[PDB]
From a paper:
[name] (DFR) and flavanone 4-reductase (FNR) reduce dihydroflavonols and flavanones, respectively, using NAD(P)H to produce flavan-(3)-4-(di)ols in flavonoid biosynthesis. Anthocyanidin reductase (ANR) reduces anthocyanidins to flavan-3-ols. In addition to their sequences, the 3D structures of recombinant DFR, FNR and ANR from sorghum and switchgrass showed a high level of similarity. The catalytic mechanism, substrate-specificity and key residues of three reductases were deduced from crystal structures, site-directed mutagenesis, molecular docking, kinetics, and thermodynamic ana-lyses.
The structure of PvDFRa reveals thirteen α-helices and ten β-strands. Its Rossman fold domain, an NAD(P)H-binding signature, consisted of seven parallel β-strands (β1–β7) with both sides surrounded by eight α-helices (α1–α8). In particular, the existence of two α-helices (α7 and α8) between the β6 and β7 establish its overall topology of βαβαβαβαβαβααβα, closely resembling those of extended short-chain dehydrogenases/reductases (SDR). Calculations through PDBePISA, which evaluates interactions between neighboring molecules in crystal lattices for the purpose of predicting biologically relevant oligomeric states, indicated that the Gibbs free energy of the binding interface (ΔiG) of 0.3 kcal·mol−1 between protein molecules, reflecting PvDFRa likely exists as a monomer in vivo. Despite a lack of cofactor in the crystallization buffer, an NADP+ molecule was present in the crystal structure of PvDFRa. From the early stages of refinement, a difference (Fo–Fc) electron density map clearly indicated the presence of an NADP+ molecule in the binding pocket of PvDFRa, SbFNR1, and SbFNR2 with its nicotinamide moiety properly positioned for the pro-R hydride transfer towards the catalytic site. The bound nicotinamide ring in PvDFRa, SbFNR1, and SbFNR2 established a syn-conformation, whereas the adenine ring adopted an anti-conformation. In our experiment, the NADP+-binding affinity of PvDFRa was roughly 100 times greater than its affinity for DHQ, and the structure of PvDFRa contained NADP+ in its active site even without added NADP+ in the crystallization buffer, which was not the case for the purified SbFNR1 and SbFNR2. These facts support the previous hypothesis that a non-productive NADP+ binary complex could limit the ability of the enzyme to replace NADP+ with NADPH as an abortive DFR complex with NADP+ or a dihydroflavonol can inhibit the association of NADPH. The dissociation constants for NADP+, DHK, DHQ, DHM, naringenin, and eriodictyol were 184.6 nM, 18.65 µM, 16.87 µM, 21.23 µM, 176.9 µM, and 64.94 µM, res-pectively.
Author numbering: 17 to 343
Write the structure that this text describes.
């Protein structure tokens, strides 16, 4: 059996990327994993240790701020999964140090894909922050809703530079694709929870586990939150790449709840962990869930495998093997 056309995974050393490499290898693909520094044995070793990596995984050096650095890796590939994004949201010129670099990085990826000629489809990983960051929160969001970038630059909530970065990059990738007749899929995941291979806690699990720990600054994120299992997300990205009828934006969210609802589930499911009853910065009002509809993805025939219980069972375990207390 011949390896499925070589596909690139950008940011392969990361939380989402590394697991996507695992799943693409398992599905019979030759995977070209790109990282900013393949000489960093620490970050590269987990990838090379993956099942099937010896035969079908290769590591490539590339940087989103370095025009053309992805040309060699993409050349000859049938698909590109763009998961990398700049994550340094603590600068003093976010427009020029985060926003523009994020949009120029995605556009340069698209250019390299066009030049290659061999790429039939690009799968861009967006974020829920490109959908529902507006002044008036709606009860249901789908792939047709777009964050209000003007609103973000006005009130500058926590993480505003990231919402505008991804929202503008998402819009720019689509516009470039349509202008040059390219096949682009944009996948919108909420907070992603699941196993990780890095020795450090993924930033999404710091939020997900903020109730078990005492990570109070993350409480506002859990106020009205949506979840997806990392495995479901990666499987959906492979599904959407292989389905000939797939096109456009897709929401990949399997669970919506509130901080109060999440506290209850962890209370009944983990008596071993002390779950508070009240959370600073969050009143005792009426909180209803905000739903991210994945109808478009499910209509194509995709099905989620994991529940929110599966997610937290997997996160607590991997973390328990290091960065969190067993309490
Ligand atoms: N995890 C979630 O909950 C979540 C939710 C919604 C959307 N997403 C999106 O999923 C994608 C993955 O994020 P993540 O959770 O996996 O964070 P992450 O663990 O930090 O991985 C992201 C990758 O981006 C790479 N990167 C940053 N700047 C780069 C550059 N100039 N050139 C090449 N690579 C660069 C990082 O490599 P280095 O080690 O060299 O910095 C890093 O491996 C992002 O696009 C994110 O917006 C994630």
């Amino acid at each position: 059996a011949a390896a499925k056309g070589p596909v690139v995974v950008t940011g392969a050393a990361g939380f989402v990327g590394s697991w996507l490499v695992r799943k693409l290898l398992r599905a019979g693909y030759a995977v070209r994993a790109t990282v900013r520094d393949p000489a960093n044995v620490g970050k590269t070793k987990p990838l090379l240790d993956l099942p099937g990596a010896a035969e079908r995984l290769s590591i490539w050096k590339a940087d989103l701020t370095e025009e053309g650095s992805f040309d060699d890796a993409i050349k000859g590939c049938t698909g590109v999964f763009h998961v990398a994004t700049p994550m340094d949201f603590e600068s003093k010129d976010p427009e020029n140090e985060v926003i523009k670099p994020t949009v120029e990085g995605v556009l340069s990826i698209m250019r390299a894909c066009k030049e290659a000629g061999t790429v039939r489809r690009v799968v861009f990983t967006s974020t829920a922050g490109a959908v529902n960051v507006e002044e008036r929160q709606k009860p249901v969001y789908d792939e047709n809703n777009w964050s209000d970038v003007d609103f973000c630059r006005r009130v500058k909530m926590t993480g505003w530079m990231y919402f505008v970065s991804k929202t503008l990059a998402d819009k720019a990738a689509i516009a470039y694709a349509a202008e040059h007749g390219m096949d682009l899929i944009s996948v919108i995941p909420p907070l992603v929870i699941g196993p990780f291979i890095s020795a450090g806690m993924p930033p999404s699990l710091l939020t997900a586990l903020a109730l078990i720990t005492g990570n109070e600054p993350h409480y506002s994120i859990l106020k009205q939150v949506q979840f997806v299992h990392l495995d479901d997300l990666c499987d959906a990205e492979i599904f959407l790449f292989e389905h000939p009828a797939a096109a456009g934006r897709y929401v990949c969210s399997s669970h919506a709840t509130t901080i109060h609802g999440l506290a209850a589930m962890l209370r009944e499911r983990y008596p071993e962990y002390r779950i508070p009853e009240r959370f600073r910065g969050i009143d005792d009002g009426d909180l209803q869930p905000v739903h991210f509809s994945s109808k478009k993805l499910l209509d194509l025939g995709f099905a989620f495998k994991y529940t929110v219980e599966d997610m937290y069972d997997a996160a607590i375990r991997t973390c328990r093997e290091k960065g969190l207390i067993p309490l």
